[PDB]
């Protein structure tokens, strides 16, 4: 086996494995080299045959089309937000309230 490098664009790549479908649960997905975190939901959008994935105003990935099936999948990240505590003075009481 002889290898030549730094001379031509790479086209003989190794084998890449694949996983199973997921729905309504955010995961650290990877679609054709595009990585990210978000849920996988059914999309009502319409694409063109040369389009791979979509984008929005905020320069973020929004819709990803899997190569296995022609139907497209939307991308929405996990439910993120701050957490706040609602408490009285420690000299008065001890109980606390959790605010999301």
């Amino acid at each position: 086996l002889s290898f030549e490098l730094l001379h031509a664009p790479a086209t003989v790549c190794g084998p890449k494995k694949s996983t199973n479908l997921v729905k309504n649960k955010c995961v650290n997905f990877n679609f054709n080299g595009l990585t990210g975190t978000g849920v996988l939901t059914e999309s009502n959008k319409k694409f063109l045959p040369f389009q791979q994935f979509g984008r929005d105003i905020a320069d973020t990935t929004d819709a990803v089309r899997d190569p296995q099936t022609l139907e497209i999948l939307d991308i929405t990240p996990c439910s993120f937000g701050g957490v706040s505590v609602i408490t009285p003075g420690t000299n008065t009481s001890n109980q606390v309230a959790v605010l999301y």
Partner: peptide, 22 residues
């Protein structure tokens, strides 16, 4: 609401979270 303030309201139209006003 008054008609004037309602008309004014109708005329006026990651990791980032926008807190709602009190």
């Amino acid at each position: 609401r008054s008609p004037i303030e309602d008309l004014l309201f109708n005329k006026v139209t990651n990791g980032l979270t926008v807190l709602p006003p009190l």
